[PDB]
Design a protein around this ligand. Structure first.
Ligand SMILES: CC(C)(COP(=O)(O)OP(=O)(O)OC[C@H]1O[C@@H](n2cnc3c(N)ncnc32)[C@H](O)[C@@H]1OP(=O)(O)O)[C@@H](O)C(=O)NCCC(=O)NCCSC(=O)c1ccccc1
Ligand SMILES: CC(C)(COP(=O)(O)OP(=O)(O)OC[C@H]1O[C@@H](n2cnc3c(N)ncnc32)[C@H](O)[C@@H]1OP(=O)(O)O)[C@@H](O)C(=O)NCCC(=O)NCCSC(=O)c1ccccc1
Ligand SMILES: Cc1cc2c3c(c1C)C(C)(C)C[C@@H](O)N3c1c(nc(O)[nH]c1=O)N2C[C@H](O)[C@H](O)[C@H](O)COP(=O)(O)O
Ligand SMILES: Cc1cc2c3c(c1C)C(C)(C)C[C@@H](O)N3c1c(nc(O)[nH]c1=O)N2C[C@H](O)[C@H](O)[C@H](O)COP(=O)(O)O
Ligand SMILES: [Ca+2]
Ligand SMILES: [Ca+2]
Ligand SMILES: [Fe+3]
Ligand SMILES: [Fe+3]
Ligand SMILES: [Fe+3]
Ligand SMILES: [Fe+3]
Ligand SMILES: [K+]
Ligand SMILES: [K+]
Lengths: 514, 514
């Protein structure tokens, strides 16, 4: 039980071989140093901390998915478009996970069944100095089998263990865990599930997915999609205590039960005066400071991990980082692409969810109309995307002469290609939204800022595409950037001196010439 | 090659055993008698005509799917709700079709490779006296394999063979045949496909499906869904001439090639003066008289059929019949149910598309809100249904105290439960619609009434549901219809005399007491 063929340690070895690994040996605080160093180097190389404060048996990795280029190099993709198409193909073709014995799983070298103090072994962090609680935000849930209709689910859930071996368990309403909890709410037996830590990067990648249930409904095989992404099946193992399955190649696994009707407060102040949605609880995906709520409790029965002499790795990450944004929006991009290809194939060329929009709030699709009969399909695509995403606030459709990765080019399409009377779609006013957007706090009024009181404004679908047959009038003004060579006119020093000053939309426009 | 284990002949034997079969021996005209007798007995028992005018080798069945109760008795379903749930389960679990040899397929007893006059063997009908052409509207297309991404497609296409062995081939834009034609438009080799006639009733049932491609995308297995519906795999056989596969247990098969870039007019008058969308071409699904268009040509290379001494059965049906409505809207109902269950399970209770709405224009879903967090999901459902259906004009969401099969009860919900300022959704103005609705002719103007010139008004999503927490104010007024027995007060004669006068919404209200 010491090999994990494709896991976090092999990924660290590949990162060290490629030269992408930044590793230090100095003792780092989980309090306001890991997330601070992650935000200082946001969207960059992975950082490995060998020594963690008050965690003598644990290492810590961060910014693992921060640069999307090294992630695409890890999984063998050339660019983001190839990544989107390959992960859509992997969604439609899962690899069924294999079950190995309880003696070759590396996560079951040490099995703690007593003295269950989760905060002693797992590294809880604080993100900002405005917080009061150190929370565990590193684990993915793992529901395999009868509670997920014979499929499998992996996904992140934040936990605050402020009762020793009992901690809160934050569930987004509408998610797969919400659907499992809603089905088994009125039950006597609690839901058995495991929280896995230091998982293979494919499992992190698929655990980022969410609110894409027209493509990945309840009963799908998310671990199958992770196995299809890494190109080999993800190994499972039966738990020691509960009746479930874990990722065998993880670094830590918490086994236990979820009690849905046992709801407790996440912080001490919101418990002190009984108010959800007011007190600060570590910044959220929307790009604002989060709020503390009531949440069901996760009753840990066993802590299994690797050997503490091997120093198992945990992956703590801040929420408003490019790390967290890549983790969610990559597989959500390919799911949106899959839905638009299902509705009408051959029209959508590329789907991109930038860091700027949010995890669950926005997307940009790029359509190409081949004839007059395909005119109008972008409005079907925008309405279907906004309806099938639960609280996406802004979907933008652009034409094929646009750089989809530049927000300056998107703003140019918003300025020049949008009729404000006809091209703004508000499809579903009064539907379901995401309560973590404070624009829905503005609709709750003086009631409690919970999901029961918010009112969704309906989303915003912006059709910034060129009408068919008007491609000559909306033609983009390509210059002669390949008809002239600057090496004739200037030397190397003038050329790189002028090239060092360019940044952004000029860098996008100088490649394309438009 | 004389057994078809589950096919049209075995279904006729079961209908005769149950007493549902109405069979005559008098010679019926395909000109204005078959569709007339079908409309006289619309929504009733199957009619079998042994002698057809100028078709001495052919029998004709009609109103086969006219009564939905005998269809549910044929496939083993108790009511329509069980049918919707079972066909949704069959959609998510197809049975892979089997391939049998060319000598046990009953449709290949007689293989005609010369003298290909399709109108000599296949029965073309005229529906109304306003028409001029007798068209073939009995066959389903069958694309299996590489042209459908390794999946299979079955679906109806009307054909008018006015060049001997070359006929038009009407394709709805957006359909599976449209997607196949759009992918292989710019190709030199024509698309090989077979038109199958007198197919098993499961294949007719699944061939009715259309514009449900979030659930049944390109590359799905529609013959697999037919095999899952009948409970045994549908047998296939390799063609004699072209490189394709047919339904082995059919009665007639036309083998040939589809030429997409060879477009010809459907009638003689529209060919005479070059106008699509004006001249009458046999009433359509919208409930209006249809129009003649240009269409790609189907070049028949071989006619294979059963033995002419066995008198193979064809199934001609009028378009504005309950037959045709059941055929499309049954599997489309279960597809809409599957999509709403994928987005958020446990909320939608029942989906119904009545005969009154249309084939592709409307649907009624019935939701049940279990808590405050599920309030608003019906608007997501309405927007997703209207976006993922290509030109559904009217989707209505009602609560669970409504009889979904009574249009009077739906009109009552429209009167009493709709806020006209907030509960009318217009999600996708300017999207793709269905050109056969003349409300989109009103938007084409003085241009040609084609799909290239219509402008969709956006659909109409009506939220007629009760808001959560106001179930006491919107409570339906249940009387004491089971507290009193009429057999005490009156005799049998007064009771059935009073019961014979009740019809419609009073019949719905007297069962429920509301
Ligand atoms: C949505 C709740 C949980 C609603 O609680 P409250 O309003 O306080 O109301 P209650 O709790 O009292 O229950 C009401 C009554 O209804 C019933 N009932 C309830 N549930 C169910 C059920 N499932 N099934 C069936 N029934 C159910 C139940 O009977 C109950 O009555 P009882 O309890 O029997 O007396 C609220 O706590 C909240 O706002 N959570 C935060 C929402 C959120 O957005 N989290 C996002 C995290 S993602 C983010 O971190 C992230 C993303 C990406 C990257 C990074 C980060
Ligand atoms: C939609 C068309 C086919 C458009 O034709 P038109 O407007 O005359 O225009 P054109 O034909 O000239 O082509 C334009 C140019 O664009 C190109 N291009 C075209 N296509 C493609 C392609 N696929 N892929 C790629 N490219 C394509 C092509 O280059 C072409 O130029 P060329 O040809 O190279 O010079 C029209 O004929 C029509 O309205 N059909 C009826 C629509 C309908 O609703 N049928 C519903 C039946 S269901 C009902 O029966 C029913 C349902 C349920 C129960 C019962 C019953
Ligand atoms: C990448 C990432 C995602 C999430 C979270 C974090 C990270 C790093 C935390 C720091 C731990 C903070 C919180 N958190 C979190 C969460 N979803 C929840 O329901 N509950 C949570 O407390 N999401 C999004 C999940 O990853 C989604 O996968 C979501 O759970 C839906 O997934 P699914 O149901 O569709 O499968
Ligand atoms: C039940 C039935 C359905 C149809 C038709 C008829 C009947 C009886 C005709 C009398 C022959 C008249 C026409 N006709 C018809 C048609 N669809 C077309 O693209 N072209 C057609 O000329 N539909 C609807 C098809 O059955 C749908 O299945 C549609 O084809 C989409 O199917 P799919 O691509 O999603 O698989
Ligand atoms: Ca992204
Ligand atoms: Ca129906
Ligand atoms: Fe999941
Ligand atoms: Fe526009
Ligand atoms: Fe099909
Ligand atoms: Fe209402
Ligand atoms: K996920
Ligand atoms: K079909």
């Amino acid at each position: 039980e010491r090999v994990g063929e494709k896991d976090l340690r092999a990924a660290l070895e590949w990162f060290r071989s490629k030269g992408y690994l930044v590793e230090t040996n100095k003792e780092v605080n989980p309090d306001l140093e890991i997330t601070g160093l992650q935000k200082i180097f946001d969207g960059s190389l992975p950082m490995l901390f060998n020594n963690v404060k008050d965690m003598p048996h644990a290492r810590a990795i961060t910014n693992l998915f921060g640069d999307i280029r090294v992630v695409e190099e890890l999984f063998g993709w050339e660019n983001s478009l190839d990544r989107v198409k390959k992960v859509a193909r992997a969604i439609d073709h899962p690899l069924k996970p294999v079950i190995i014995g309880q003696d070759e799983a590396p996560v079951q070298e040490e099995v703690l069944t007593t003295d269950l103090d989760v905060n002693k072994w797992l590294t809880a962090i604080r993100h900002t100095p405005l917080e009061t609680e150190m929370t565990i935000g590193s684990g993915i849930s793992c529901v395999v089998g009868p509670y997920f209709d014979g499929g499998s689910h992996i996904g992140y859930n934040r936990m605050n263990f402020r009762w020793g071996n009992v901690g809160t368990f934050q569930i987004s309403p509408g998610s797969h865990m919400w659907q499992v909890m809603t089905e088994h709410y009125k039950d006597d037996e609690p839901i058995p599930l495991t929280m896995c830590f230091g998982v293979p990067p494919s499992c992190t990648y698929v655990a980022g997915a969410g609110f894409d249930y027209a493509i990945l409904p309840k009963g799908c095989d998310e671990i199958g999609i992770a196995g299809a992404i890494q190109g080999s099946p993800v190994r499972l193992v039966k738990c020691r205590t509960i009746d479930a399955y874990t990722l065998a190649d993880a670094e830590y696994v918490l086994e236990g039960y979820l009690h849905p009707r046992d709801k407790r407060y996440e912080t001490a102040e919101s418990e002190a005066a009984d108010i959800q949605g007011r007190f600060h609880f570590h910044p959220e995906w929307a790009g604002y400071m989060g709020k503390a709520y009531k949440a069901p409790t996760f009753h840990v029965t066993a802590i299994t991990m690797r050997r503490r002499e091997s120093k198992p790795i945990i992956f703590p990450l801040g929420v408003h980082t490019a790390d967290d944004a890549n983790i969610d929006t990559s597989v959500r991009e390919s799911a949106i692409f899959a839905l638009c290809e299902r509705l009408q194939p051959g029209i959508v060329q590329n789907v991109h969810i930038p860091y700027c929009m949010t995890d669950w709030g926005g997307c940009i699709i790029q359509v190409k109309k081949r004839n007059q009969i395909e005119e109008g399909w972008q409005r079907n695509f925008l309405a279907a995307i906004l309806a099938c995403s639960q609280g996406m606030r802004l979907a933008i459709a652009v034409s094929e002469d646009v750089d989809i990765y530049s927000m300056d080019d998107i703003m140019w399409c918003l300025t020049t290609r949008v009729n404000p009377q006809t091209d703004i779609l508000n499809p579903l006013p009064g539907g379901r939204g995401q309560t973590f957007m404070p624009a829905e706090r503005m609709t709750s009024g003086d009631k409690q800022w919970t999901a029961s009181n918010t009112q969704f404004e309906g989303g915003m679908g912006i059709d910034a595409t060129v009408p068919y047959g008007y491609e000559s009038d909306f033609h983009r003004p390509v210059y002669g950037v390949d008809l002239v060579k600057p090496e004739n006119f200037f030397d190397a020093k003038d050329i790189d001196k002028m090239k060092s000053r360019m940044a952004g939309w000029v860098l996008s426009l100088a490649r394309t010439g438009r």
